[PDB]
Amino acid sequence: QTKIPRGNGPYSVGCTDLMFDHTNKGTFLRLYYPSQDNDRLDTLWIPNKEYFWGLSKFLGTHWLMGNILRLLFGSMTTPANWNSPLRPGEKYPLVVFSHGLGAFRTLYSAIGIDLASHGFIVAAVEHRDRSASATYYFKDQSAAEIGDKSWLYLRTLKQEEETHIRNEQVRQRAKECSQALSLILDIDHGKPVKNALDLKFDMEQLKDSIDREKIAVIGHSFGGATVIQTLSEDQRFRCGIALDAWMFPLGDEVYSRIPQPLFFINSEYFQYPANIIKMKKCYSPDKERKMITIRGSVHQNFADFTFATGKIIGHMLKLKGDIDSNVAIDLSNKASLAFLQKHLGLHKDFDQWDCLIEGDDENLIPGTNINT
Ligand SMILES: N#Cc1cc(NS(=O)(=O)c2ccc(C(=O)O)cc2)ccc1Oc1ccc(Cl)c(C(F)(F)F)c1
Structure with a gap:
């Protein structure tokens, strides 16, 4: 079937989408969660044709390639029970997840599904900062009722725009992570919400489902910078995990304003000194910072297209590294x-993997190969 790996944990996994409010300033997320039932693994991985058009634009091609991607991947599933009921009787820790540049909310399901299978609820946000390849919203409530979507595509930047616009984007991304957290916490305590998407998952199930002290933010690439900006602004997040963070968007002021523990998980082949030096600026003896590098991995080993192609085509497209993609994602997870x-x-029992935080594995490097 799909080659996106099933979660390794003991919980079965459900998945649904939540948009509230309906506007371009509302919150849009894909939720992965422990499910009551394991009926059938039927979640659509990339759910709309416009995401494929957006990916082609991000990759520098045109609408013909978008349609080719859609033919190849437009019916692929990811292994979660679409709209399955939430498993009752337990309060779950919560992760807010931030996607990289040119991604969107559904492309990190290997991570989201594995976390949910270990008993987390995961809210993968879709950013409206024009960093997603595509996203959508509704111009009024009637449009939401009809499914009359307004699409917003990735913004390309002139070099003169990069410093300012990327920092504006990382600030909006952090606001969107904090807003998504507030939406989930408000639902957890009984806020009535009308999902702008008509889906057979009743959001009232999320009432009293969150362990409100156990909140983390995780993100890849642009989303790794978003982890750091979000932690700086919002102390409801109690720790962060930055997956191959791209640090360029961050302003100098954040590095001293992160009280929470922070974990950097890097790929071997993406990092470079100008990026790593900003990670080192986060280090201080009064704070917990850990760093590991996954041997033989590339930037996109953290994202789902690392599973979507064969070994040789994946390597040529830089979707796969020297390491097996399942071995790499297992180490990160x-x-x-x-x-x-x-x-x-x-x-x-997750402390059985404490040695991985120290980089103690044949496929891990403690710290980084970049000595700066
Ligand atoms: N999975 C994912 C995925 C993740 C991202 N965001 S990112 O990982 O942060 C990232 C950031 C920057 C760069 C770069 O500057 O290059 C790259 C990646 C973007 C597109 C993705 O999707 C495809 C990626 C490649 C290809 Cl070939 C296709 C395909 F054509 F096959 F559909 C889809």
Whole structure:
């Protein structure tokens, strides 16, 4: 079937989408969560043709390639139970997840599904900062009722625009992570919400479902910078995991304003000194910062298209590294779970992977190959 790996944990996984409010300033997220039932693994991975058009634009091609992607991938599933009921009787720790440049909310389901299978609720935000390849919203309530979507595509920047616009974007991304957290926490305490999407998952199930002290933010690339900006602004997030962070968007002021623990998980082949030096600026003896590098990995080992092609085409497109993609994502996910247990205070068995936080594995490098 799909080659996106099923979650390794003992919980079955459901998935749904939530948009509220309906406007371009509302929150849009894909939720992965522990499900009551494991009926059938039928979640559509990339759910609209316009995402494929957006990806082609991001990759520098035109509408013909978008339609080719749609033919290849437009019916692929990802292994979660679409709209399955939430598993009752437990309060779950919560992760807010931020996607990279040219991605969108559905492209990190390998991570989201594995976290949910270990008993997390995961809210993968879709950013409206024009960093997503595509996203959509509704211009009024009637448009939402009809499914009359307004699409917003990735913005390309002139070199003169990069410093200012990328910092504006990372600030909007952090606001969107904090707004998504507030939406979920408000639903958890009984706020009535009318999902702008008509879906057979009743959001009232989320009432009293969140362990409100155990909140983390995780993100890849642009989303790794978003982790750091979000932690700086919002202390409801108790720790962060930055997956191959692209640090360029961040202003100098954030590096001293992050009280929470922070974990950098890097690929071997993406990092460079000008990027790594900003990660080192976060280090201080009064704070917990950990860094590991996954041997033989490329930037996109963290994103779902690392599973979507064969070994040789994937390597040529830089979707795959020297390391097997399942081995790489398992290391990132297991090290993440250990870090989350330690700094959220979970009473699980994730500390069996504490050694991964130290880089103690044949496929891990403690710290970074970039000595700067
Ligand atoms: N999965 C994911 C995925 C993730 C991202 N965001 S990112 O990982 O942060 C990232 C950031 C920057 C760069 C760069 O500056 O190059 C790259 C990546 C963007 C597009 C993606 O989707 C495809 C990527 C490649 C290809 Cl070939 C296709 C395909 F054509 F096959 F559909 C889709």
